[PDB]
Amino acid sequence: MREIVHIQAGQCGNQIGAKFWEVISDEHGIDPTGSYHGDSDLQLERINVYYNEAAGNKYVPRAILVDLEPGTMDSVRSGPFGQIFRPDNFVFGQSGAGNNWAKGHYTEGAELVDSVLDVVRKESESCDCLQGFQLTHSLGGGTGSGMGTLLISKIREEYPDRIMNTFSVVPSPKVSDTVVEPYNATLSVHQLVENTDETYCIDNEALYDICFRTLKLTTPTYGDLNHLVSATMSGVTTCLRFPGQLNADLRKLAVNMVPFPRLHFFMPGFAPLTSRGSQQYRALTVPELTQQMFDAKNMMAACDPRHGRYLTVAAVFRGRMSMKEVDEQMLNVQNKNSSYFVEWIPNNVKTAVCDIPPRGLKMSATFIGNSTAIQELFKRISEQFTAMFRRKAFLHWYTGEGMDEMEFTEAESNMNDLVSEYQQYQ
Amino acid sequence: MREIVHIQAGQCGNQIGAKFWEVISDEHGIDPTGSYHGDSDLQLERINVYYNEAAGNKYVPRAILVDLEPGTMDSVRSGPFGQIFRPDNFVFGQSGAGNNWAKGHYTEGAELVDSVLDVVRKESESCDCLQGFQLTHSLGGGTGSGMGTLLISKIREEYPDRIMNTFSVVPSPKVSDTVVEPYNATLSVHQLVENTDETYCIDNEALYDICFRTLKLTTPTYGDLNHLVSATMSGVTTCLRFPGQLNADLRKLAVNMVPFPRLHFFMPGFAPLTSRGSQQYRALTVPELTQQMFDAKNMMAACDPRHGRYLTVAAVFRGRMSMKEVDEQMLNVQNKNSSYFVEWIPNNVKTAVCDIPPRGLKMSATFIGNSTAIQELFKRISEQFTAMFRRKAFLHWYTGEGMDEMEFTEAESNMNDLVSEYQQYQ
Amino acid sequence: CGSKDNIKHV
Amino acid sequence: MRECISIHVGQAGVQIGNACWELYCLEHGIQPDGQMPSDSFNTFFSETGAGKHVPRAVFVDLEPTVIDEVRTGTYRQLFHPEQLITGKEDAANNYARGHYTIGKEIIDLVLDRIRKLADQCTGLQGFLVFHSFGGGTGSGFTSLLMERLSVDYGKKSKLEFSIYPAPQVSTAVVEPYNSILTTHTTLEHSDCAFMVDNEAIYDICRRNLDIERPTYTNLNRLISQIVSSITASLRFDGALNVDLTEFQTNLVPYPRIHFPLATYAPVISAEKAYHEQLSVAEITNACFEPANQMVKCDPRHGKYMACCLLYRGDVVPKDVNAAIATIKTKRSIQFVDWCPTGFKVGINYQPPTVVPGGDLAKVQRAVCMLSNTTAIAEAWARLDHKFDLMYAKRAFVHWYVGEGMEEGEFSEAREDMAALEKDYEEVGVDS
Amino acid sequence: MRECISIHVGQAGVQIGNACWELYCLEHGIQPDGQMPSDSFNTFFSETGAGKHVPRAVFVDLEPTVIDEVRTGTYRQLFHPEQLITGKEDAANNYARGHYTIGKEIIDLVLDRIRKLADQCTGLQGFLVFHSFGGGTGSGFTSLLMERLSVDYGKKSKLEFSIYPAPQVSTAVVEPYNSILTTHTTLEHSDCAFMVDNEAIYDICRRNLDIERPTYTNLNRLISQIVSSITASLRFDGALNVDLTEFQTNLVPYPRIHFPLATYAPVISAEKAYHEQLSVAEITNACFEPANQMVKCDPRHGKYMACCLLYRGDVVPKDVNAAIATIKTKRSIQFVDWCPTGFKVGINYQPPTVVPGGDLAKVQRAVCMLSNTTAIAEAWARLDHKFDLMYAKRAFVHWYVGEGMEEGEFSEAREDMAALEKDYEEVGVDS
Ligand SMILES: CC(=O)O[C@H]1C(=O)[C@@]2(C)[C@H]([C@H](OC(=O)c3ccccc3)[C@]3(O)C[C@H](OC(=O)[C@H](O)[C@@H](NC(=O)c4ccccc4)c4ccccc4)C(C)=C1C3(C)C)[C@]1(OC(C)=O)CO[C@@H]1C[C@@H]2O
Ligand SMILES: CC(=O)O[C@H]1C(=O)[C@@]2(C)[C@H]([C@H](OC(=O)c3ccccc3)[C@]3(O)C[C@H](OC(=O)[C@H](O)[C@@H](NC(=O)c4ccccc4)c4ccccc4)C(C)=C1C3(C)C)[C@]1(OC(C)=O)CO[C@@H]1C[C@@H]2O
Ligand SMILES: Nc1nc2c(ncn2[C@@H]2O[C@H](COP(=O)(O)OP(=O)(O)OP(=O)(O)O)[C@@H](O)[C@H]2O)c(=O)[nH]1
Ligand SMILES: Nc1nc2c(ncn2[C@@H]2O[C@H](COP(=O)(O)OP(=O)(O)OP(=O)(O)O)[C@@H](O)[C@H]2O)c(=O)[nH]1
Ligand SMILES: Nc1nc2c(ncn2[C@@H]2O[C@H](COP(=O)(O)OP(=O)(O)O)[C@@H](O)[C@H]2O)c(=O)[nH]1
Ligand SMILES: Nc1nc2c(ncn2[C@@H]2O[C@H](COP(=O)(O)OP(=O)(O)O)[C@@H](O)[C@H]2O)c(=O)[nH]1
Ligand SMILES: [Mg+2]
Ligand SMILES: [Mg+2]
């Protein structure tokens, strides 16, 4: 039935996508050569959601890899799971955005967007019933933010009735990876808030905290972070590939999570997360998964939900469970923490159950929360933006690409408008 | 049904808890790895009182490890039975109290209490019907006294209807292990008398006396002392795990023990206690246990009850006895030894019987007496504290942590009022 | 350098 | 892919280039004759013939002795014969000679060679230029060449690794004149300029490497290590890649402030390597101490505008984040208020390579640190002062005037320098 | 876990440090080169390289002779080279030179090294300082270092091992000036300060060890054994652990009275070892004779205020309690009335280790005792008396004044000492 097209922009997007495709292939029993060697018919039952079929049993993932510099996906091609992708989906530029939003949005993106759209259209024509699009990117870099916003705008123009999901990497609150990181982020949101159906915000600092404190990893690398992100990505869309007691696809999640069009930023989570030394000390059950999901420490965005109130919540369980247990756990959570839920929405939670567990685990759960506490992050970014724009720091880099200060003013005004809306609805 | 959460603070608490959990595990037939290897169904029938059940037959004690320095709990972790505890329950600081009540109650305890309370709450929510809490500590140390007082206050605020029991290592009357032993002791009592339900007082010197004169041990270490302390601990709550002809839980003991809210300091004792050579010469019958329990030299508190009068008395027998013999011994004790029983309470004795012998014994009995002879201990502590406080000795150490002399004055006044009450009731 | 131009921005 | 072109001019530039190319050949496993005994190094080396790799370098001087030393050295059969361009009479420490009289004789040939080398590249990213401020050929011809390049290309980035004059150590009398003139004429034609001081490197070698006789070879080896760590992200792959453009985007807040300072860590000797564990946190801390900066200026006298860290080898991103946070909390360092986020980080997998017979010990990780701070303003002031001391009495002016430099130019340069100093004072004040 | 830093100042400090570090390396089985031939010793040693352990020690002196002796000895490859800091001219038994003129030259470098070592620790709890009152460098630089440490940190403990001047044996003419000045300066910056007396240790070696030629090696070995018994509770686990903070919480009743006395038992020779079956009670008794004290003063002349016992090896808590009770009931010693509970006791499993070539036999149990007593007041009085005898005629005063120390400072110091004497006689009176 439905099918999902995957987009992949920038270095962060490319690495997350590589890990995500390795995880997906391992889940469906496909070797890196692209030949099916699974054991259960359910792997091929809905394999068309992500993988095409070519003459000779080989499977081609329905993905597009885009970057303005060739190094990252050159490494992707050279490394493992590089022969699985069709080479026509590798789109490269020569210059690179150089952490400049304007360069990646107006100059290099303007050159590459036609080829990327041609590839997207060709890939989506073979689709039988397109469900939507997935995008992976970061709001800090130039290529990611700029070309992602451009692609999203063009797609929303082309396919207004489809679904767009983005897995962004929002800037961290403590330590930055880029000096101009504020500017780009704001310039990104001014587009995202208008063109994206739903966005899941991911913070690297929260992932470091999870890996250190919970998983007890002494040396967490980007591989582990992308592993966690890929686990969440797989958990979100599991109801499209396996049968379950209660089903939920992308459209239903969107319907349940956007009370108003301008509020589509959520904070994802996952459970269970245990090390290889304390996993035998705990028996995983539905109450354990529920308690780990509703933990401010377990959130994948560096934003405490206890400072605000939830609007809506989604819980996607994987494995064999009892509907009564899920319902009683949700009722108990809503009763105990009733101070963190808006009064003008009863039954904030929406649940889905998928029969097929993650390969190896007994049970699992994915949490998606739409909390007003995110406004904190938003206002923080705005603050830093102003702290720079008062002195015109690094402004010449952007204004030499054709952008004008009125664009910065508009972006800041819209950013503050969104913050005010989030405050009012709380 | 009823379930108990166990907490220990400080070096004394950690050591006593390690010995106690080893004793309990051997009683229920659980290997150091945590996998049940028993031979009776009763060992699992009520094992939920102390052990949660993990995945794969493993059982995890419902215990919390609290200390301000990591050496003691590191030794606990590395030693035997160190792989039976959940590693998340080990809570350690870095600074350490340094035999300072103020440092562990206002400065370090303020930092650690949040995490410890989070762990305690997480443990408690998994309890079906929580019965109460157990604490093990000493009134002479800094970490034990201060941090345990802070936890008791916070827990009483959080759970006002539950049961709080403490095992306190009161300072010895002859030889002190710390110069600042007076101050800390008072600063603990002034809080304990307000927040705890019942407290058992144990003196190390009395234990030395018991293992020297009675057990005929030449070289008693802290191992033996903790071993029989844990024997008493197990004897107190044996009715919660095995059926008996007449059983009593913690709440009934509290109801029958304390006549007034400010008199909850008991003196425990255990019987039989014989050497390895004299076990072949003496008959083990109910009158033998009853005569040993009501013996001045057999008490675990260094205060002779012959100087005062009992208020109430509890006798928890264990094994296969005859009710007629128990009641006849109680009548004989109350009749012949009537000189030290209060006149305004008839039937000072409350008896319980547990069918299961301890592990490999025939009969045993635990004694808990609420005597007015503990006023001697309070007199002595008052005298020493006032003698030290008149010259302001060591006072700058406490006042440099934030406290003021008004706290010392009010603590001494409150505990002197307790002295007056204990004297008046006799 | 024109660092003083936008200091009046709200 | 992305290609970088290197230009080395003057004695200092040529010798630093020799050290840099020896380091590159050693790191990439290329023999001095251009053959590989056993491929991302297309960035620096092009393939010509059967298995021969030719570096993309241009060596320029108006005096043939140092280039002749190159032509007869160990790397004689490595460089293209036409890439080594020589004059006959040097500028003789005269900026006007290397700018107006002698430079214009071979500037066209140099531009022709550069165009021929650049047309081959498909993804050219920028130019690397090595020179010195005090020298006549260095300053004059470098200024002329960058003017010509900025006119010809404009969009491509241009970088310098220049030798700033030392506060006390000097090897010329006409040094302030040339330094001021070249800074004034290169201020508007550059994107980023990394500067080092011979005195600071002497102090580093004495204090850390425990070398009492630090000849120019050791200094050039350290500088080459820094350049290699800068270009590593281009020459290899890592968890976080940084090309040349991101440097100017992240370190240059205003077009007239593009003079960062370059340091390095860990600079330790062989014997002290055993007593020290080179962890990420400690080398990050060492990169920020004033005693390790390779320009004789105290960072504590000013405030940082932007900072860039480049890690190599065994490095974990969480440790990098923790160390940067710890540096941020510390109040020994100062940051401008209008720059809340003042760090750009890059991580690469390739560890540094120790040149045999060298002075640095073998380590598994290293950090290159670039900082754009107002602490350099003091240095500028000092130079200006010296200029004034020698210009109130018209000392040595006739030498420059006789070569076609009109006198008013000097005033212009001084005026511009004053304005630049004012610029720093304006951005060093919080709001 | 919990970390400690050892500081050694001057000739006496450096020699005692060498003995202590040899003893620690032997105890933990570390070869002189830093390797291990086969772990709670992270308190003193830091891991580095491939299984190399570097002590957390800093060696400071204003003369290079003794540090160079260390740098060429058997333990040359054990210490980090940057931790041995030397000046060029010593204070020459001048407090002013070591405190004002010479010490200020290297105080900054010493503090830099101190903070570099301190940042490496996660749970640092205190510093150990070894020095001498009589010397110039020792007293002056120790006072300066304590001032700087108290200003920088303030909360961490600072314990002191110091060589109190002997009542009769003297090795300098200006001992009273230096002692009084350093005591006045450091009186409000040391949390606790144990003392040893060279004359007392000479007496101990003569009476007990049957040695007639006790070079400084024997005295330093004794002191190292004592400090090992003090820090064993950190380095090993025991039935009753004692931290560094507990010492000061239990032995200092007032901030101005922090001068305990250190003893050790058993001190016997090999020949007499076989004829005495040493037990806990007899060792506890032996620790209380005046002849076994390591400060030449009679405790029977004063009253104890607090006592600390540290037991090692085969020790049973019941025997400890019985022995301490017997000591308490014995009326030949006295305790202040306002301290009814005057004992702290700690027990450790690991027995003391016998250094080969030493002069102490092998025992399975040992006791270290520290007593804060008023009998030390007499010593202060004697020192003050000597100071007056030398100050009425202003002998040697010009030597101190010429280094910048104002004359009035002397008066302050003397007056302060007077107050301290009064302090003791105020707390030695029962009520
Ligand atoms: C044998 C076994 O049961 O051991 C587990 C295991 O020990 C743990 C730690 C696994 C393990 O995961 C990690 O080690 C890990 C480390 C850092 C970050 C993320 C993962 C495991 O690798 C993961 C692996 O999971 C799978 O096989 C799923 O299919 C998983 N796929 C992958 O992780 C994967 C990795 C590389 C290539 C292809 C797939 C998955 C998870 C979520 C959604 C889709 C797929 C399993 C169960 C284990 C190991 C082997 C140790 C965990 O896996 C997940 C993400 O569910 C980590 O959190 C769980 C908890 C498990 O107890
Ligand atoms: C048949 C018989 O009487 O054998 C006894 C024994 O001889 C005596 C002397 C035992 C023995 O205990 C001691 O004398 C003793 C005391 C301190 C330190 C070491 C040993 C015994 O060790 C004790 C041990 O008792 C037990 O095993 C109990 O279950 C005890 N648990 C443990 O001792 C234990 C050991 C290892 C691991 C975990 C627990 C217990 C009792 C009540 C409540 C909980 C636990 C046994 C069989 C004996 C010996 C071996 C001599 C006594 O111990 C107890 C508490 O039962 C001393 O008082 C009793 C009286 C007994 O007569
Ligand atoms: N670090 C370093 N600096 C050098 C080196 N060679 C020369 N210099 C610097 O260059 C300055 C002298 O100017 P040069 O660069 O030699 O002048 P030039 O490039 O030969 O040009 P002309 O003056 O016309 O000959 C000195 O102050 C040195 O500091 C070198 O090998 N390493
Ligand atoms: N117990 C003991 N005392 C020592 C030792 N070495 C020196 N001393 C004492 O130190 C005193 C002499 O002062 P120094 O320690 O040499 O003074 P300094 O620290 O070197 O500083 P300067 O006076 O400037 O030389 C003598 O009275 C000795 O008692 C030693 O190894 N053991
Ligand atoms: N989680 C995660 N984040 C990444 C990864 N790589 C880069 N990032 C983030 O992306 C930002 C850098 O943007 P980048 O995509 O490299 O710039 P671009 O090349 O212009 O698109 C940094 O803030 C990083 O935190 C990755 O592998 N995983
Ligand atoms: N019975 C018993 N008493 C102990 C044990 N360990 C310590 N104590 C007593 O506890 C007191 C020391 O308190 P401690 O816990 O070390 O101080 P803290 O570090 O502040 O908690 C001493 O008076 C000891 O008598 C033990 O294992 N058993
Ligand atoms: Mg030249
Ligand atoms: Mg000396």
CATH number of the domain encompassing residue A123: 3.40.50.1440
A403 and A254 co-located in one domain:
no
Q: Are E3 and E210 in contact (CB under 8 A)?
A: no
- Partners of B134 in the beta sheet? B6, B165
The residue of chain A nearest to residue D258, with distances taken between CA atoms, is A394
Which token pair is D33?
């004759």
CA of D395 to the centre of ligand 3 (A): 22
- Domain range spanning residue B221? 2-259
Residue of B nearest to E236 (CA): B71
Same domain, A9 and A92: yes
Distance CA E400, CA E98 (A): 11
CA D267 from chain center: how many Å? Answer: 18
Output the CA angle D37-D38-D42, nearest 5 degrees: 95
Tell whether residue E10 is among the known ligand binding residues. yes
Interface test with E, best of B391, B392, B395, B401 (most E CBs within 10 A): B391
And the tokens for D138?
Answer: 């260095």
Tell me how close the Cα of D277 comes to any Cα of chain E, in angstroms. Answer: 5
- Pull the structure tokens for residue A163: 């679904």
Residues with Cβ < 8 Å from D422, sequence gap 6 or more?
none
> β-strand B51-53 against D365-373: which pairing, if any?
unpaired
Q: What is the CA radius of gyration of chain B?
A: 21
The minimum CA-CA distance between B328 and chain E, rounded to whole Å, is: 39
Question: Which B residues in the span 136-155 are in contact with E, Cβ-Cβ below 8 Å?
Answer: 142
Q: How far is D82 from chain A (nearest CA, A)?
A: 29
What are the structure tokens assigned to A225, written together? 């972070």
Q: How many CB atoms lie within 10 A of CB B174?
A: 13
Q: Are B105 and B144 in contact (CB under 8 A)?
A: no
Between the alpha carbon of residue B402 and those of residues A191, B101, E256, the distances in Å are 54, 11, 21
List residues bridging with D285 in a β-sheet: none
Q: How far is residue D400 from each of residues D178, D184, D396, D405, D413, measured CA to CA in Å?
A: 10, 16, 7, 6, 14
Is B363 in a helix, a strand, or coil? strand
Q: Do D431 and C4 touch (CB under 8 A)?
A: no
Burial of B372 (0-12, 13-18, 19+ CB in 10 A): buried
A360: left (phi > 0), else alpha (psi -120 to 50), else beta? left
Q: D429 in the Ramachandran plot: left (φ > 0), alpha (ψ -120 to 50) or beta?
A: beta
Q: In what order do the strands lie in the sheet with B310-319?
A: B90-92, B63-67, B2-9, B129-138, B164-169, B198-202, B265-271, B363-371, B310-319, B349-354
Six-digit token pair at B275? 């050497």
- Eight-state DSSP code of residue B202: E
Q: Which of the other chains make 3 or more beta carbon contacts under 8 angstroms with chain E?
A: B, D
Closest CA to A21 of A57, A50, A48, A41: A50
Q: For chain E, how far is it from start to end, CA to CA, in angstroms?
A: 44
Q: Which of B385, B27, B404 has the alpha carbon at shortest distance from B185? A: B385
Q: How many domains does chain B have?
A: 3
Task: Give strand pairing partners of E53.
Answer: E47
Residue partners of B289: CB distance under 8 A and separation at least 6: B271, B272, B317, B363, B364, B365
DSSP string, D90-159: --TT-HHIIIIISHHHHHHHHHHHHHHHHHH-SEEEEEEEEEESSSHHHHHHHHHHHHHHHHHTSSSEEE
List the 362-401 stretch of A: residues with Cβ below 8 A of C. Answer: 386, 389-393
Q: How far apart are CA D373 and CA A397, in angstroms?
A: 19
Q: Going by C-beta distance under 8 Å and a sequence separation of 6 or more, which residues neighbour residue B411?
A: B186, B187, B189, B190
Q: Are residues A272 and A252 in the same domain?
A: no
Q: Is the CB of D137 under 6 A from ligand 3?
A: yes
Using a CB–CB cutoff of 8 Å, tell me whether A387 touches chain D.
yes
Phi, psi (degrees; rounded to nearest 5) at B244: -150, 170
DSSP class of residue E191?
Answer: S
Q: Measured between alpha carbons, how far is E68 from E70 in angstroms, rounded to an integer?
A: 5
> What residues flank ion ligand 8 with Cβ within 5 A?
E 11, 90, 137
* Whether the Cβ atoms of residue B189 and residue B223 lie closer than 8 Å to each other: no
Point out the domain boundary residue: A373, A390, A415. Answer: A373
Ligand nearest to the CA of E97: 4
Query: D355 by DSSP, 3-state: which?
Result: coil
- State how far the Cα of B102 lies from the Cα of B99, in Å rounded to an integer: 9
Q: Is the Cα torsion angle D173, D174, D178, D184 positive or negative in sign? A: positive
Are B10 and B100 members of one domain?
yes
* CA D226–ligand 7 middle distance (angstroms): 24
Instruction: Give me the amino acid identity at B289.
Output: L
Residue D164 gets which letter from DSSP? Answer: P
The full length of chain A comes to: 426
Report how far residue D185's alpha carbon sits from residue D416's, in angstroms, rounded to the nearest whole number.
10
Question: What class has domain D261-375?
Answer: alpha beta
Same structural domain for residues A255 and A332?
Answer: no
**Residue B191 sits in the same domain as residue B163:** yes
C-alpha of residue D137 to centroid of ligand 7, in Å? 7
Q: Is the peptide bond before B272 cis (omega within 30 degrees of 0)?
A: yes
Q: From E132, E144, E194, E400, give the residue whose CB has the most ligand 4 atoms within 8 Å, as the site to mutate.
A: E132
Q: What is the dihedral of CA B63, B69, B74, B77, to 10 degrees?
A: 0
Cβ D257 vs Cβ D305: under 8 Å = yes
Residue A30 in contact with residue A19, Cβ under 8 Å? no
Between CA D356 and CA D379 the distance in angstroms is: 36
Residues of E assigned a catalytic role: 246
One of 2.30.30.100, 3.40.50.970, 3.40.50.300, 1.10.287.600 is the CATH number of D376-431, namely 1.10.287.600
Give the DSSP H or E segment for D272.
helix D270-273
Would you call the peptide bond into E266 cis, given omega within 30 degrees of 0 as the criterion? yes
- Going by C-alpha positions, the residue among E348, E314, E124 that lies closest to residue E237 is E348
Q: In C, which residues are within 8 Å of A387 by CB distance?
A: none
Collapsing DSSP to helix, strand or coil, A126 comes out as: coil
Final residue belonging to a domain, choices A259, A282, A311? A259
Rounded Cα distance between E53 and E414, Å, is 46
Q: Domain E1-260 in CATH: superfamily?
A: Tubulin/FtsZ, GTPase domain (3.40.50.1440)
- Cβ atoms of residues A208 and D318 within 8 Å: yes
The minimum-distance atom of ligand 6 relative to the CA of B16 is 27
Q: In terms of CA atoms, which chain C residue is nearest residue A412?
A: C10
Contact A220 D317 (CB under 8 A): yes
DSSP annotation of D56: -
Q: Both A28 and A104 in a single domain?
A: yes
**Three-state secondary-structure class, residue D312:** strand
Residues B229 and B285 in one domain: no
Are the Cβ atoms of A280 and B88 closer than 8 angstroms? no
**How far does the CA of residue C5 sit from the closest CA of chain A (Å)?**
7
DSSP structure class, residue A358: P
- DSSP states along E353-380: -PPTT-S----SEEEEEEEEETTHHHHH
Residue B349 sits in a domain whose CATH number is: 3.30.1330.20
Please give the span between the terminal C-alpha atoms of chain C, in angstroms, as a whole number: 21
Pairing relationship of beta strands E3-9 and E124-132 according to DSSP bridges: parallel
* B196 Cα to the center of ligand 6, angstroms: 21
φ and ψ at A19, to 5 degrees?
-65, -40
Contact residues for E98 (Cβ-Cβ < 8 A; gap 6+):
E62, E90, E91, E135, E136, E137, E138, E139, E140, E141, E144
The DSSP symbol for A238 reads G
Question: A358 CA distance to ligand 1 centroid (A)?
Answer: 9
Angular region, D163: left φ>0, alpha ψ -120 to 50, beta rest: beta
Please tell me whether residue E257 adopts helix, strand or coil conformation.
Answer: coil
| Residues B118 and B135 both lie in one domain | yes
Breaks in chain E (C to N > 2.5 A) come right after: 38
E51/D contact by beta carbon, under 8 A: no
Closest CA to A369 of A325, A303, A318: A303
Q: A8 is written with which tokens?
A: 């992949």
Question: Residue of the nearest CA to atom 36 in ligand 1?
Answer: A23
Q: What is d(CA A83, CA A70) in angstroms, rounded to the nearest whole number?
A: 17
Cβ contacts of residue A86 below 8 Å, gap of 6+?
A60
State the Cα–Cα distance between residues B320 and D13, nearest whole angstrom. Answer: 99
CA distance A291 to A270: 11
Structure tokens that stand for D43 in this block: 């960035």
Angle at E14 between CA E13 and CA E20, to 5 degrees: 85
Q: How many residues does chain B have?
A: 426
The alpha carbons of chain E give a radius of gyration, in whole angstroms, of: 21
Q: Which helix (H) or strand (E) holds B13?
A: helix B10-27
Three-class secondary structure of residue E59 per DSSP:
strand
Beta-ladder partners of E365: E313
**CB contact set of A271 (below 8 Å; sequence gap of 6+):** A288, A289, A292, A293, A298, A364, A365, A366, A367
The answer to whether A278 contacts B86, with C-beta atoms less than 8 Å apart, is: yes
Q: Which helix (H) or strand (E) holds B254?
A: helix B250-257
Q: Which helix (H) or strand (E) holds E409?
A: helix E407-427
- Chain B nearest-CA residue for A332: B125
* Residue given tokens 């005859």 in the structure block: B322
- Same domain assignment for residues B273 and B346: yes
What single letter denotes the amino acid at residue A355?
D
Q: State whether residue B52 is helix, strand or coil.
A: strand
Cα dihedral sign, B182-B188-B192-B193: positive
Listed by start position, the domains of chain E span 1-260, 261-375, 376-431
| Residue where one domain finishes, among candidates B195, B226, B259 | B259
Angle at D346 between CA D342 and CA D348, to 5 degrees: 165
Report the alpha-carbon angle E131-E134-E138, nearest 5. 35
Structure resolution in Å? 2.9
Token pair recorded at residue E274: 């076989």
- How far is CA D409 from each of CA B398, D165, D401, rounded to the nearest angstrom? 74, 21, 10
Strands across the sheet containing E304-313: E84-86, E57-61, E3-9, E124-132, E157-163, E192-196, E261-265, E365-373, E304-313, E343-348
Instruction: Classify residue B364 by its DSSP letter.
Output: E
Cβ separation C3–D431 shorter than 8 A: no
> Quick one: B308 and B413 in the same domain?
no
* Angle made by CA atoms B213, B214, B220, in degrees to the nearest 5: 70
- Per this entry, what is the length of chain D? 431
> Considering only CA atoms, which of A204, A209, A166 is closest in space to residue A188?
A166
Crossing angle of helices D10-27 and D136-152, in 10° steps, is 70
